[PDB]
Amino acid sequence: MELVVDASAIAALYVPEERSEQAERAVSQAQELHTLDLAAYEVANDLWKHARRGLLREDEASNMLEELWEFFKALKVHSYAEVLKDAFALALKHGVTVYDAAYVALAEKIGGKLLTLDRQLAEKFPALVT
Amino acid sequence: MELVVDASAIAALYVPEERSEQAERAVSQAQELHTLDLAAYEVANDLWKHARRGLLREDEASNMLEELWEFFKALKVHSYAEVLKDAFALALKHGVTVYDAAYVALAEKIGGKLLTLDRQLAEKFPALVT
Ligand SMILES: [Ca+2]
Ligand SMILES: [Ca+2]
Ligand SMILES: [Cl-]
Ligand SMILES: [Cl-]
Ligand SMILES: [Mn+2]
Ligand SMILES: [Mn+2]
To answer: Which UniProt key words apply to this protein (chains A, B)?
Structure first.
């Protein structure tokens, strides 16, 4: 099983975090983890929000961003060129953002599934989500 | 002059659109245009919004996304790996999003300037923006 992990899924893995048994089994059993270039910015941005809200010290958030960087080396990172056209058509059809549609496009492309903690996304693509 | 164009700047160029004399002179005089992988998703997402709001027919929005794709071949497209660490530190320091900070990080990296139609962004980096 090829497994796409979006930004919410990476956030739960790259540092110690609580995860459903379901999430863990998917990651555990995957042949390989895949994501998009996009996820790097999305995870980093969520880290920025946490810092500015006073939940992380600035040096602590900077250290975590190093860890994210190191985590990304264990991922197969795909580019926008591979999915952009499919992502847009999926966004138009299903009424989800191109950002979200992109991960679904990628799961389809690699013949795999998507792990997302986004329940709303997960409901729109039952055949593609774990 | 190396010129970074963000998503708002690409939107004004990849199809016939009104532009300030200032924007035109910057693009005209640039040695080369540069952007991020990120901009592809951001422009496509803005196109999706326009379609869903009833401003573009679905086939018309799909044709424009083809044009965007063809436009991107004239751009030097840089990846998240080149800017992510700088983008985060700039986001923390200046109180802007990692998404925005990324283009500024890229202008700095290539020794060039940034063309953005985002006045708020443009005010935070006067030395880096056209
Ligand atoms: Ca396709
Ligand atoms: Ca640097
Ligand atoms: Cl916030
Ligand atoms: Cl909208
Ligand atoms: Mn979401
Ligand atoms: Mn903006």
So the answer is: Hydrolase, Magnesium, Metal-binding, Nuclease, Toxin-antitoxin system
